[PDB]
Design a protein around this ligand. Sequence first.
Ligand SMILES: CNCc1cc([N+](=O)[O-])ccc1Cl
Length: 330
Amino acid sequence: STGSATTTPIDSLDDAYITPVQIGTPAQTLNLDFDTGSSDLWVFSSETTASEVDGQTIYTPSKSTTAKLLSGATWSISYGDGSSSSGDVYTDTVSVGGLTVTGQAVESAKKVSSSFTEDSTIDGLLGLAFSTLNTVSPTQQKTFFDNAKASLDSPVFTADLGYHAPGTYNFGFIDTTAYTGSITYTAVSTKQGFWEWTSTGYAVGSGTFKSTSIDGIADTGTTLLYLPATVVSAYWAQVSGAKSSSSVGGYVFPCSATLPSFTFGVGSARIVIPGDYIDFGPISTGSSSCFGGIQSSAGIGINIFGDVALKAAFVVFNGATTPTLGFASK
Ligand SMILES: CNCc1cc([N+](=O)[O-])ccc1Cl
């Protein structure tokens, strides 16, 4: 089996991407944020505290003939941005782009934090990190990918995110028309439950490549690129007037600037992020200070190759017995 679904930016800045997912019988279609940095499939639902729902489409398990309460199971998750959600659990049929899993754990939110409430376009998350991070208690549950894997033609999924445009998540096959050149594969550590790998270095604009190991995670659920302070300082030093603002919460730059590209290494290969991908626009409406798409990971505790980096590549999440990550230019 295979699946193929289009993923669409939620706004003009590519703050996140949503992908339609069919849950239950008859199908209830919810738009979920596919998140390779977490391992819970959770949804706004008929159980979500009413005051915490503002425009989202909800899953109603009582209207699904295939829904079953997973008795006694609860879940609770906190994300790196300080947001959170929690609730109870149903099993139901879940389909993504024509690929169907029966008996998938669908985590029904009873509570969500304010940033979820405020994002009317995101009806929940579909986690694609390793199932060891799943928060369901007392019986940990598997991700959609882990449940699908045995049925897939090949034990892989791919992320092909667009810059200010739709893109694609494929399951079970590599679309050889979706990238240019060859795919470079690199080792993954699953020790922390993430798609964790080591970049071989970086360059700023047309500058020389600095060979240096940068351990980080491939995280489709994080908007920006978070790298060590040394690397980030070297980047923003090339932008006149750029500075780190404690009041804003990161590097800002004059909206009149032309940003340099940023290159990261994957083995002996190189992925180039165009300067425009690093522009996240005015910090507040009408401001001439613009927010940067490359930020320091100091204080996070991990480097994060989020959408700014991933959307510059065709990315293979290889879930074979020894997992690996592949990157190609596109
Ligand atoms: C865990 N990956 C990043 C993240 C993703 C989301 N998401 O809605 O997809 C929310 C918070 C964070 Cl910190």
